[PDB]
């Protein structure tokens, strides 16, 4: 993680189930082999593709 | 100068020509959506009225 001045706003707890929900998760992705394209999804969705 | 019968003589399937002419080299969803209103006038029909 990262944060501005490393000032993260919540406490240690707290953080630590932000990362727990995402590692749980991307291993229930990685179960079901779907993380590989989503991960690399990143570099296109800030662009809107009208159809 | 007038013309005479002018609307009856404009005929959708030109329209869509000249849609398609003037579209050239755009994304393909602009074509579409600019082509659909001739497509559907050259396939219309006119309600006979209150008899
Ligand atoms: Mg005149
Ligand atoms: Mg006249």
Same mark, same amino acid.
């Given at each position: ?5 490393? +000032?993260?706003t919540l +406490? ?14 991307? $291993?229930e992705?990685? &179960?079901? #082999?779907?993380? +590989?394209?989503?991960? $690399? &999804?990143?570099r #296109?969705?800030?662009t809107?593709?009208?159809? | 100068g007038? @013309?005479?019968?002018?609307n009856?003589?404009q @005929?959708?399937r ?9 579209? %050239?080299? $755009?994304p393909?969803?602009?074509?579409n ?9 050259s @396939?219309?029909?006119? %309600?006979? #009225?209150? #008899?």
């Amino acid at each position: 993680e990262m944060a501005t001045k490393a +000032d993260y706003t919540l +406490d240690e707890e707290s953080r630590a189930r932000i990362k727990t929900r995402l590692f749980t998760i991307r $291993q229930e992705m990685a &179960s079901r #082999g779907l993380w +590989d394209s989503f991960r $690399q &999804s990143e570099r #296109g969705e800030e662009t809107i593709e009208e159809r | 100068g007038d @013309n005479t019968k002018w609307n009856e003589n404009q @005929n959708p399937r030109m329209f869509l020509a000249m849609i398609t002419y003037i579209t %050239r080299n $755009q994304p393909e969803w602009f074509r579409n959506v600019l082509s659909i209103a001739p497509i559907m006038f050259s @396939n219309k029909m006119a %309600r006979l #009225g209150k #008899g």
